[PDB]
Amino acid sequence: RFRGEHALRRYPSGEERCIACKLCEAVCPAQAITIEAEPRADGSRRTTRYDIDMTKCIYCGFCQEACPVDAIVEGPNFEFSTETHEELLYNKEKLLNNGDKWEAEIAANIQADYLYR
Amino acid sequence: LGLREIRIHLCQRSPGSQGVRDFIEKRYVELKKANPDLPILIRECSDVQPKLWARYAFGQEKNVSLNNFSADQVTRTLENVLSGKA
Amino acid sequence: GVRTSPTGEKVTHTGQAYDDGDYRRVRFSDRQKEVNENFAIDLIAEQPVSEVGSRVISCDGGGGALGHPRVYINLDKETKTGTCGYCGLQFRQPHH
Amino acid sequence: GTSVKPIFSRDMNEAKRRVRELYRAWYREVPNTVHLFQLDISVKQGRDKVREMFMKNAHVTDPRVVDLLVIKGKMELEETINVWKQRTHIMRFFHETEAPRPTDFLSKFYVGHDP
Amino acid sequence: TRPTIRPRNDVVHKQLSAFGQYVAEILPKYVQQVQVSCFNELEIFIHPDGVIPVLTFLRDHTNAQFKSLADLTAVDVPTRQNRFEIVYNLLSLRFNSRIRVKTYTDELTPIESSVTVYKAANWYEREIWDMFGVFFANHPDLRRILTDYGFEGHPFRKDFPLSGYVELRYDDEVKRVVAEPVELAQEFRKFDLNSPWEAFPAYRQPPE
Amino acid sequence: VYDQVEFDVPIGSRGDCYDRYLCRVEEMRQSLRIISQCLNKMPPGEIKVDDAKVSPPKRAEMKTSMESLIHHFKLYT
Amino acid sequence: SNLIEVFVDGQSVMVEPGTTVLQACEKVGMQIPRFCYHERLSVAGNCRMCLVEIEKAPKVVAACAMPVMKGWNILTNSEKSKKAREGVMEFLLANHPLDCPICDQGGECDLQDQSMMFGSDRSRFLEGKRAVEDKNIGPLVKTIMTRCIQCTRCIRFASEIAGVDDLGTTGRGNDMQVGTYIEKMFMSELSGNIIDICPVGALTSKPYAFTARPWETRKTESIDVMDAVGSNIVVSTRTGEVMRILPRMHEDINEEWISDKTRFAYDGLKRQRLTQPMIRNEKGLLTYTTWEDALSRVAGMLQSFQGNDVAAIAGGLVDAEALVALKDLLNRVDSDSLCTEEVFPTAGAGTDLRSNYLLNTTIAGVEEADVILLVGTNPRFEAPLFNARIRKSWLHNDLKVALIGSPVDLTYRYDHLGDSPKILQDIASGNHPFSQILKEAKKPMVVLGSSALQRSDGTAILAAVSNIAQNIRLSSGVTGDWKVMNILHRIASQVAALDLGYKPGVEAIRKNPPKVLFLLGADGGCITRQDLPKDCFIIYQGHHGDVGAPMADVILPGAAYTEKSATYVNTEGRAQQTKVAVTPPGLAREDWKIIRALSEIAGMTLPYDTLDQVRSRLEEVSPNLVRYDDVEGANYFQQANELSKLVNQQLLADPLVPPQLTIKDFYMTDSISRASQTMAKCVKAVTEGI
Amino acid sequence: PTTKPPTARKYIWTNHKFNVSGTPQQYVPYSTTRKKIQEWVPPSTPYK
Amino acid sequence: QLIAVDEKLDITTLTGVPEEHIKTRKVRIFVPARNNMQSGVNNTKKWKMEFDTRERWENPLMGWSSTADPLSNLVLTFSTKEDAVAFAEKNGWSFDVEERKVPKPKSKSYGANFSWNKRTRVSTK
Numbered sequence A: 001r002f003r004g005e006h007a008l009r010r011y012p013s014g015e016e017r018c019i020a021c022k023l024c025e026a027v028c029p030a031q032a033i034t035i036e037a038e039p040r041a042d043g044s045r046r047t048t049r050y051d052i053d054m055t056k057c058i059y060c061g062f063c064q065e066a067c068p069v070d071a072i073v074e075g076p077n078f079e080f081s082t083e084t085h086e087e088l089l090y091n092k093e094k095l096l097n098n099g100d101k102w103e104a105e106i107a108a109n110i111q112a113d114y115l116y117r
Numbered sequence B: 001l002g003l004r005e006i007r008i009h010l011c012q013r014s015p016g017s018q019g020v021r022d023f024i025e026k027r028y029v030e031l032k033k034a035n036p037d038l039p040i041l042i043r044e045c046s047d048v049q050p051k052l053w054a055r056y057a058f059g060q061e062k063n064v065s066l067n068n069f070s071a072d073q074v075t076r077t078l079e080n081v082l083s084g085k086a
Numbered sequence C: 001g002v003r004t005s006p007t008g009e010k011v012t013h014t015g016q017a018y019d020d021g022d023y024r025r026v027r028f029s030d031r032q033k034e035v036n037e038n039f040a041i042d043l044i045a046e047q048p049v050s051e052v053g054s055r056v057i058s059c060d061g062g063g064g065a066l067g068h069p070r071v072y073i074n075l076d077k078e079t080k081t082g083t084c085g086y087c088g089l090q091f092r093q094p095h096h
Numbered sequence D: 001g002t003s004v005k006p007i008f009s010r011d012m013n014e015a016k017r018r019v020r021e022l023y024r025a026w027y028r029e030v031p032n033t034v035h036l037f038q039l040d041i042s043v044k045q046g047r048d049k050v051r052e053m054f055m056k057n058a059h060v061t062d063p064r065v066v067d068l069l070v071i072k073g074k075m076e077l078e079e080t081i082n083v084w085k086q087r088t089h090i091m092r093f094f095h096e097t098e099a100p101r102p103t104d105f106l107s108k109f110y111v112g113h114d115p
Numbered sequence E: 001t002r003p004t005i006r007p008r009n010d011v012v013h014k015q016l017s018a019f020g021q022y023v024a025e026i027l028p029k030y031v032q033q034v035q036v037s038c039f040n041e042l043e044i045f046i047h048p049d050g051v052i053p054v055l056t057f058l059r060d061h062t063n064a065q066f067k068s069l070a071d072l073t074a075v076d077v078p079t080r081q082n083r084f085e086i087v088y089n090l091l092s093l094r095f096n097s098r099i100r101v102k103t104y105t106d107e108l109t110p111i112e113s114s115v116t117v118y119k120a121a122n123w124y125e126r127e128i129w130d131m132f133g134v135f136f137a138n139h140p141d142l143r144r145i146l147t148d149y150g151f152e153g154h155p156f157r158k159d160f161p162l163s164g165y166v167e168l169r170y171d172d173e174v175k176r177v178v179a180e181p182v183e184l185a186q187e188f189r190k191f192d193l194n195s196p197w198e199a200f201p202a203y204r205q206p207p208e
Numbered sequence F: 001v002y003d004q005v006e007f008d009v010p011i012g013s014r015g016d017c018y019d020r021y022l023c024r025v026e027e028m029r030q031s032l033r034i035i036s037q038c039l040n041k042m043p044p045g046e047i048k049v050d051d052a053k054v055s056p057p058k059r060a061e062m063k064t065s066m067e068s069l070i071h072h073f074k075l076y077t
Numbered sequence G: 001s002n003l004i005e006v007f008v009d010g011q012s013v014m015v016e017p018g019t020t021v022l023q024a025c026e027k028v029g030m031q032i033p034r035f036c037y038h039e040r041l042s043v044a045g046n047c048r049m050c051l052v053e054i055e056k057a058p059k060v061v062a063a064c065a066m067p068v069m070k071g072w073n074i075l076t077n078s079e080k081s082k083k084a085r086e087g088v089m090e091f092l093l094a095n096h097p098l099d100c101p102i103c104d105q106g107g108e109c110d111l112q113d114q115s116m117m118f119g120s121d122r123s124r125f126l127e128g129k130r131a132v133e134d135k136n137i138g139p140l141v142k143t144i145m146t147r148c149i150q151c152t153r154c155i156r157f158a159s160e161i162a163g164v165d166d167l168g169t170t171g172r173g174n175d176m177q178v179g180t181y182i183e184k185m186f187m188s189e190l191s192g193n194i195i196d197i198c199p200v201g202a203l204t205s206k207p208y209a210f211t212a213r214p215w216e217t218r219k220t221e222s223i224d225v226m227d228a229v230g231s232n233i234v235v236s237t238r239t240g241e242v243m244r245i246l247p248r249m250h251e252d253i254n255e256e257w258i259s260d261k262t263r264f265a266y267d268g269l270k271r272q273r274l275t276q277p278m279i280r281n282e283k284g285l286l287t288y289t290t291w292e293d294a295l296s297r298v299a300g301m302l303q304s305f306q307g308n309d310v311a312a313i314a315g316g317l318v319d320a321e322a323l324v325a326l327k328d329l330l331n332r333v334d335s336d337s338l339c340t341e342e343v344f345p346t347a348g349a350g351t352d353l354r355s356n357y358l359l360n361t362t363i364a365g366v367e368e369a370d371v372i373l374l375v376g377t378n379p380r381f382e383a384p385l386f387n388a389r390i391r392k393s394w395l396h397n398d399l400k401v402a403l404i405g406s407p408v409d410l411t412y413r414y415d416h417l418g419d420s421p422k423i424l425q426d427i428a429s430g431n432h433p434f435s436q437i438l439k440e441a442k443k444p445m446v447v448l449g450s451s452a453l454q455r456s457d458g459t460a461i462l463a464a465v466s467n468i469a470q471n472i473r474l475s476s477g478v479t480g481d482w483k484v485m486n487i488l489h490r491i492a493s494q495v496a497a498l499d500l501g502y503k504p505g506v507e508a509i510r511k512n513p514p515k516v517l518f519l520l521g522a523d524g525g526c527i528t529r530q531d532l533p534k535d536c537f538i539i540y541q542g543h544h545g546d547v548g549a550p551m552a553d554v555i556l557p558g559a560a561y562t563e564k565s566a567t568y569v570n571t572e573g574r575a576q577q578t579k580v581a582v583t584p585p586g587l588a589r590e591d592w593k594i595i596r597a598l599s600e601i602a603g604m605t606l607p608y609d610t611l612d613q614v615r616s617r618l619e620e621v622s623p624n625l626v627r628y629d630d631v632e633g634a635n636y637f638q639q640a641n642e643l644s645k646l647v648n649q650q651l652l653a654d655p656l657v658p659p660q661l662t663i664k665d666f667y668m669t670d671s672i673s674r675a676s677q678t679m680a681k682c683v684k685a686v687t688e689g690i
Numbered sequence H: 001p002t003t004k005p006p007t008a009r010k011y012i013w014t015n016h017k018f019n020v021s022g023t024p025q026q027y028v029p030y031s032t033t034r035k036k037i038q039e040w041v042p043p044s045t046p047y048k
Numbered sequence I: 001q002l003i004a005v006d007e008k009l010d011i012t013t014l015t016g017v018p019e020e021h022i023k024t025r026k027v028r029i030f031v032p033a034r035n036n037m038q039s040g041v042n043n044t045k046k047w048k049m050e051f052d053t054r055e056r057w058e059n060p061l062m063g064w065s066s067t068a069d070p071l072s073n074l075v076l077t078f079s080t081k082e083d084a085v086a087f088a089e090k091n092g093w094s095f096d097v098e099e100r101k102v103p104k105p106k107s108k109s110y111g112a113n114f115s116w117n118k119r120t121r122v123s124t125k
């Protein structure tokens, strides 16, 4: 259940789960999420911008409980201190990389906890 | 010194514009035949005294009140403006 | 499917890359630009189209409660295939 | 009609009397504030700032607004005298780090859309 | 009702209504309205001139003796001619009951300080003055308690902007912290969440 | 549920710091007592009010039922 | 009188006979739940969401269709009506797809909101849902019919408002579907409104798909400038970017609808934009420069020449502020050659009398007329909402319509009197039977389009139409303040320019070629460098790079209608003002501010400095430009008609052909429309269809 | 993970990386969207 | 005990608002228009006061929307038009007032759908 650094997950096929519904952005109590979207080249509903300000985030986990497709999660990493302010302003590439980096542990934790949700 | 255009602002229902309304309705057509190339802009005010504007060369503008004037009074004002005499 | 801009920078899956005259490229000097190497559009394009002998079928993304909301896809049109609006998986009736 | 409950002043004369008392107190305090906060400004410019702050409100014709302004100025003086403020609070009256904003039409037209 | 619905307590409702009638009868000079909510909370609306008498009666009367001032605050309603309403919350330990007293004021009318009735009101009235600009007469020492020194405006007013007018930073040229007009790197995103299709028919207003 | 648990309220006698210290220690002991009672009397059932117009539904219901998805959307937006 | 007494939850209210239960409840302040009922459409009564209980009645009634009877007590919040609402919502949600996260109408769904407010909080539907295949009805409306609730709002709107009978229901029972039954595009000037009327995400805007959520958008109320109707609109913006255009309700102008161009041409505001001042370098090419250099270069030429050598042309999207600013600036130069690209006959009264160039009957007045005659115009494309009002009057008031010109499709039947202009003379003389038809009419109306005035016979055509109107007045007598005479304008800047004293047409420029020419958004191509002397100085001020830009010497980037608070006057003579939704991009500035700065640089500083002072100057010139909802005005038909008898120009034997003949000519009219990709897609779709 | 390994995916990193702050491979933030307003391009041919 | 002074209310010197956010602003007093995407009218009941839109620009980092005015998100709700006008006047704000737009009552007749001789007869239902 513990909330760590945010990550963007994807389906087993390799496509990202996020469908740009902007529910996490609407629920975010700190307005830490910025989302922009448009139809993709194949007509899919996908984001072109997904920014999380980690210096504005309160790590409440409301975004992950508002997501209807388990796209945004707050992963178990907590040792991600930074030497500059700028590297704590995450964009979509950073969050997708975090998801690809932590997917094994994230999926194990979700399997452990999803029956309580 | 050359007159460029004349603007007449009269209110549609106010009794202060009755003379201007009568002037227009009776003799604006004759005034327009007399000056076929001079633009006489008739516009409507609202809760404002009737007024007459004259534009001269290089953007010079002067205005005179036509409040409570009869048709003859505003007529004489227009010949005074057109002829250039005070 | 990461491509390279004529300047030399990697073009991300959103297609953006700083122009030649853009001063903002200076932020990547002595550093690097994060680009995710796994393009979702290509990865979902590699998935084979599922063959089902039913007129209407449902998709939930797999895993049951761990996927997306369950939706039903009509497969009456033979010119194209039915695609899930959540997951992107494709379905088709066995023509001929 | 238009009968309202007074705060301190029934009319304008005693409101101006309180204004003059507050001005006297501020004028007296300026040199002590300049010395005690180790300000780089002079006493003349501090008194000029006091005069300017008093003159910003010269248009008020309501005695209640006037005596509320006097109350606010007296709170300001109490903060200054008791050294509850630091040097930054005193120096905030001078806006030394703000680039001047030109007033004429052409400058505002050149800089941006702000009238 | 059902187990998802909060139960009602008619006995406490009747007791509060009776005591509200009692207080209104004893002080007809100041009491303007008495209300009891569905969750058993008693409110007494009074004229501003009666703050000291009503509070003294509620503190000292044998049948009331509200000896504790739980909270004192203000609410800003810009649409009213009297902009601010002052709310007093009192607790009676003798009778295990709570009462609320509301009055009103505007930007220029002072409200009498109640520090003689309750010593706890000293900081509450200071906070009200700091956040709303409501002046309290005969206060021992009225001054800002929450905002920074020299802060201009009253932030808790509805028309005060959320992020204020000035922001602070350290300037190396003058070797001190300076104040400058606010400029957001990202503007606060205003959300229009209120939906049509009105929710509670019991609170429907006449269409005038 | 505080009417369903039993504990004592420590009361001071001198109104000084020592009495408040003793009162706080006694409240710690009484909190241990209440914790014991709560552990021994935990009931079964749901954890939030079974009213989807206030409390969000479960994830499975949100991903299965139309009403649950609508209510989840509206409650989180 | 004839009012009857009825009760809503025990409270009395007096209603007219024929009032339904829904309207009786509305008079009290309650909105009855609805899905199929629309105030603008015919009653359907199929969604059954408006079921309500009448006291002492065992069976609930449909509030949208049941006329209320005297003495009825409507129980709007009784257990019976609440249970009916819950059951109907359950039935509606049984087959609905779980598409809320991917549906474009998440926070704007009537289904979602009414399920939250009147339905249950859970489902007991354990079966599988239905799925239907989507339809392709063009590049404007995206179609996902699994979300359709079969309320038939789109069908009724298409049949009654748009005049297009391409929509319907095929199948039966649960398998009944809304569509065309064939591959066919629902293309009309009002096709985009079915997106608004659709309560669910079955019909959504295709260019708007997936881009924004409703709670994020900021709402700016503004005025459309795509035509001369001036329909009220709402501009949705988010993070300083225009997202979409929504209609804003105004009963007198556009009711609830906007045209497709108005709805979808905002895509052109993000392309081909002018963002920086530009001048010519030594090679003769356009290069970027500062505001100071360009303004000084223009001011030097302005000071070099005076009088007749300085001229200005105003485009179709110019506000009154910029118009009066330019007029004052050129008057300080002693230049009166201030012209517009649109032509109006100056003979006789000209622009001196305001009623000579206005739609005197007004848009709302069409509902009162019994006979209307259209001369040399295509109202369907030139003024889509005016044509919609005509169609509504034809449908509901049994209005009789006749046309002189090309037999265009107007979405209603009319009488084609012919094509030749001599028919006007025949009607005025009295030989044509339509003259007698107009004679019997109690509220006759004659409409002449400015497109018919664009040809060389404009004065003669106007004289013939005025003769017809004068014959009507002389024969049928004075019915009152009916104002038979009318003119339909096509561009949003024409009426304001005529009110300010601009010379209609560009004949003055051709007669007296200038050496300094101002192009205030002029992209009509009326004047090119061939019509100008050698080394003529051309200044183009505008917001788009179009036909007017490349031939200019100095380019001044201006603001579009969405980027300024600007005054526009519609074809009725009603003045309206826009509001700032976003700021101009780059170095672009407000137009009147540019003119005032240029005046200061040249030493001819203008008195006004703020927008309020500009509007004070507008009031000084034409006081009606500051009355922001007034349409009333004095009728001077007799004077203009008498003055029109002086000249006797002859009519040519050329058929009346409107510029827009089919739908393909409607999408591309102005610089904003020509820079829009959505308009290009519409043109491609109508040219070749799939 | 030796007794029961994590689920294998094609997109999961094969090589784990540590914290790279204060290092040339550090994360550098940037906007991931395209230009919103397109400028007009003047023609290359002189008018006269 | 009562001054009985005749002067219009003015509290600009007490609100702490900067000088250039008082004289250069233009508030709009209006009833918000109904969102035409929905049929509900519960959002068109009260009066609103909003400020004129100022410049928004793109942050060089993150491309976020930056602003320089503090009143870009300030919206006030009023019961009546007179209350909003009084509030705007006492705060020293220049205002524009827009009259409330009400949908006019209409005549609906289900029987007109099946008309014997009028054009209101529907071709389908």
Ligand code: SF4
Binding pocket: A024, A027, A028, A029, A030, A031, A032, A033, A052, A056, A057, A058, A059, A060, A061, A062, A063, A064, A074
């Ligand atoms: S954890 Fe909370 S604060 Fe952080 S992004 Fe998610 S919703 Fe926002």
Ligand code: SF4
Binding pocket: A017, A018, A019, A020, A021, A022, A023, A024, A025, A035, A063, A066, A067, A068, A069, A070, A071, A072
């Ligand atoms: S992360 Fe989840 S909640 Fe946020 S926009 Fe994407 S799908 Fe919606």
Ligand code: SF4
Binding pocket: F070, G096, G097, G098, G099, G100, G101, G103, G104, G105, G106, G107, G109, G111, G112, G147, G199, G200, G201, G202
């Ligand atoms: S139409 Fe409404 S209820 Fe249906 S999926 Fe879209 S938002 Fe949800």
Ligand code: SF4
Binding pocket: G147, G148, G149, G150, G151, G152, G153, G154, G155, G178, G197, G198, G199, G200, G202, G203
């Ligand atoms: S498409 Fe929309 S408007 Fe048409 S019938 Fe279906 S729900 Fe109604």
Ligand code: FES
Binding pocket: G033, G034, G035, G036, G037, G044, G045, G046, G047, G048, G049, G050, G051, G062, G063, G064, G065
């Ligand atoms: S609204 Fe009456 S049945 Fe649909």
Ligand SMILES: [Mg+2]
Binding pocket: G105, G194, G195, G196, G197, G198, G199, G200, G201, G202, G203, G204
């Ligand atoms: Mg829709």
Ligand SMILES: [Zn+2]
Binding pocket: C059, C060, C061, C068, C084, C085, C086, C087, C088, C089
């Ligand atoms: Zn799927």
